[PDB]
Write a protein that binds this ligand. Structure first.
Ligand code: CL
Length: 373
DNA sequence: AGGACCC
DNA sequence: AGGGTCCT
């Protein structure tokens, strides 16, 4: 049973939000700064050589006119992110969030509903919206092609609604599973879409230049694969299954070897409301382990406002720390009476105990509310 | 708790 | 960087 999946990928998301907030930035090169880092930038800045996650000095020495806005407070980005997800959920309810700026939508049922409504002569006029990957020829008699073209039409409706209703541009990719939809959505950027017909799957997967470019193959797995002489997609396709299992475990080995062929049976999961709320701060050294209570009190204060708005409350609190020159965490249940929401002073007490439990009286402090109900 | 992955 | 997910 084949599926029609769309991957929606917002262009330079934080920059888009900031440009909407201050139109004066719309025509100037823009970078969103967090600490010493340019986490993202609009395309005007990318023209001038600015890259994501490029340190501010390197970025200013490449674009001295680069306008910098602070993006350490994620509140506005998070709000717009959920407006996108909710808009897509109106199309079809099964929407999976991947970070703040990507969504997967399973269009299968929607596509079949639209096809049922078409007349015979109507079927021969089905047209693609946007790009066809690798300029592949469409066969209107192929039912897989028809379904994917209808997927491309729904994807264009989504992108038009996002722009008309929210002012945001993004790319979309339409394919038969999540892996392929996500790989194909970035083929034409920015603000464009691409559909992958099945015959071009091997062309898409072999277009990658490192196995680390496969979604799901992270730093540790890549480093491990490279240690085995596996570098290209075809290397992973042809590597011995038995050895790969022994080195990576059978779960990781079998899944990522399927990914190397473009195979991905994973379902689109309805993300729904978030599973956790957290806030953090990075810094160079906080060994005044009495200022930590101040940092933790500030983080806790802002978090408390967010928990009130969601309406659901956390049943677990967690404190994370990073050690000077990799993280450690302590969690514990939140006492039931404390959940009625002055909750600061008890929360600080709980958190400090977790703190003291971990540190003997730091480059990061993070507080998380989780286990929601 | 810790580790893998994602943006 | 400042967030998130699920698995062991
Ligand atoms: Cl499987």
């Amino acid at each position: 049973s084949s599926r029609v999946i769309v991957h929606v990928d917002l262009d330079c998301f934080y920059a888009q939000v900031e440009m909407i907030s201050n139109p004066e930035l719309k025509d100037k090169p823009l970078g969103v700064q967090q600490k010493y880092l340019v986490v993202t930038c609009n395309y005007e800045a990318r023209k001038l050589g600015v890259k994501k996650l490029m340190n501010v000095r390197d970025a200013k020495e490449k674009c001295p006119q680069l306008v910098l806005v602070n993006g350490e407070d994620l509140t506005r980005y998070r709000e717009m992110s959920y407006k996108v997800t909710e808009l897509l959920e109106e199309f079809s309810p099964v929407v999976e969030r991947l970070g703040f700026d990507e969504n997967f939508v399973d269009l299968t049922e929607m596509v079949e509903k639209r096809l049922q409504q078409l007349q015979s002569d109507e079927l021969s006029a089905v047209t693609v919206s946007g790009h066809v990957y690798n300029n592949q020829s469409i066969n209107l008699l192929d039912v897989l092609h028809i379904r994917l073209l209808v997927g491309s039409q729904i994807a264009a409706e989504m992108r038009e609604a996002m722009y008309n209703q929210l002012g945001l541009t993004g790319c979309a990719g339409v394919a038969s599973n999540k892996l392929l939809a996500k790989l194909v959505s970035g083929v034409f950027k920015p603000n464009q879409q691409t559909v992958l017909l099945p015959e071009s799957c091997q062309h898409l997967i072999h277009s990658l230049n490192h196995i680390k470019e496969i979604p799901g193959i992270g730093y540790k797995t890549a480093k491990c694969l490279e240690a085995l002489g596996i570098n290209s997609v075809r290397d992973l396709q042809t590597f011995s299954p038995k050895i790969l299992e022994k080195e990576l475990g059978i779960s990781v080995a079998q899944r990522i070897q399927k990914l190397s062929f473009g195979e991905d049976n994973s379902p689109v999961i309805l993300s729904g409301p978030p599973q956790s709320f957290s806030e953090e701060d990075s810094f160079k050294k906080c060994s005044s382990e009495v200022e930590a209570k101040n940092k933790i009190e500030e983080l806790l204060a802002s978090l408390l406002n967010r928990v009130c708005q969601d309406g659901r409350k956390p049943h677990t609190v967690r404190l994370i720390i990073r050690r000077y020159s990799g993280r450690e965490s302590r969690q514990c249940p939140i006492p039931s009476h404390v959940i009625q929401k002055d909750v600061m002073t008890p929360m600080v007490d709980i958190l400090m105990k977790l703190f003291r439990n971990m540190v003997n009286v730091l480059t990061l402090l993070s507080v998380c509310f989780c286990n929601l109900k």
